[PDB]
């Protein structure tokens, strides 16, 4: 009886907090059309350090 | 005889809090539910909830969820409207409903308009209201009286002391500034006006003021 209802024991809530997102991340997907590969390809002859 | 039988209309401010007395009689007042019908001042009924008669449990429609206080007296089979933090759509004729239950509500309380609004009263300001050339109508010459600001309602405007309801259509007093004009048309043949007064009879008993204010030609 002290809160709010004349009878005692038992009760009803809903309880609603708006959601919102603080941080939120992505995975994403590759095509493998998109995909490249770059190869460096190469032969020794005379060469320098450089 | 039962009959649902309410506190009077009580005039209110914002932030107070008013209850709303039902008091139920001519039924064993336990066997019913007891409701409430929110009728705005102009819009239709809007019903508040009820409590249970026998429990004393309220329940309240969403919109009147939290605002309100549905608390009954079981003994003397009163029923309460209880509006706590009065705001102006608190203004509103409100009905205690008793419960048919899913056939509905049977009858009601004689109806409590609380009226929630800040102003102090104030007396009208009342004009005898003189016609000109495109004033008259035929024999009939109109005449007027412009009461304005006064707050609250109402004001009794009667015509020579209400010998004059004849041509009279008293129009329903408005709300400006929170304070009140209603303008009364008396239809006074041309032949009575101003040969005979035709005078303007403003009583306002909450600013206690009886203006009378005769119209005489500009």
């Known amino acids: 009886w002290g809160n709010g209802c004349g009878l005692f024991g038992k009760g009803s809530i809903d309880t609603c907090a708006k959601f919102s997102c603080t941080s939120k991340a992505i995975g994403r997907t590759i095509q493998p059309e998109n995909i490249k590969y770059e190869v460096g390809i190469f032969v020794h002859g005379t060469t320098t350090s450089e | 005889q039962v009959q649902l039988m309410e506190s009077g209309p009580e005039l209110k401010k914002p932030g107070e809090t008013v209850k709303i007395s039902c008091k139920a009689s001519?039924?064993?007042?336990?066997?019913?539910?007891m409701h409430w019908v929110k009728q705005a001042p102009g819009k239709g009924l809007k019903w508040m909830g009820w409590?249970?008669?026998?429990?004393?449990?309220?329940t309240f429609a969403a919109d009147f969820k939290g605002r309100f206080a549905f608390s009954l007296e079981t003994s003397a089979s009163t029923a309460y409207l209880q509006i706590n933090n009065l705001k102006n759509e608190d203004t509103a004729s409100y009905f205690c409903?008793?419960?048919?239950?899913?056939?509905?509500?049977?009858?009601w309380g004689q109806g409590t308009s609380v009226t929630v609004s800040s102003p102090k009263t104030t007396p009208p300001s009342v004009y005898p209201l003189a016609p000109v050339c495109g004033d008259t109508t035929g024999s009939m010459v109109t005449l007027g009286c412009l009461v304005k600001g006064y707050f609250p309602e109402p004001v009794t405007v009667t015509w020579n002391s209400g010998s004059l309801s004849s041509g009279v259509h008293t129009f329903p007093a408005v709300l400006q500034s929170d304070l009140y004009t209603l303008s009364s048309s008396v239809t006074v043949p041309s032949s009575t006006w101003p040969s005979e007064t035709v005078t303007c009879n403003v009583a306002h008993p909450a600013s206690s003021t009886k203006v009378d204010k005769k119209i005489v030609p500009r």
């Open positions: 409903a008793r419960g048919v239950g899913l056939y509905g509500v049977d009858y």
């Open positions: 001519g039924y064993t007042f336990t066997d019913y539910s």
């Open positions: 409590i249970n008669t026998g429990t004393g449990e309220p």
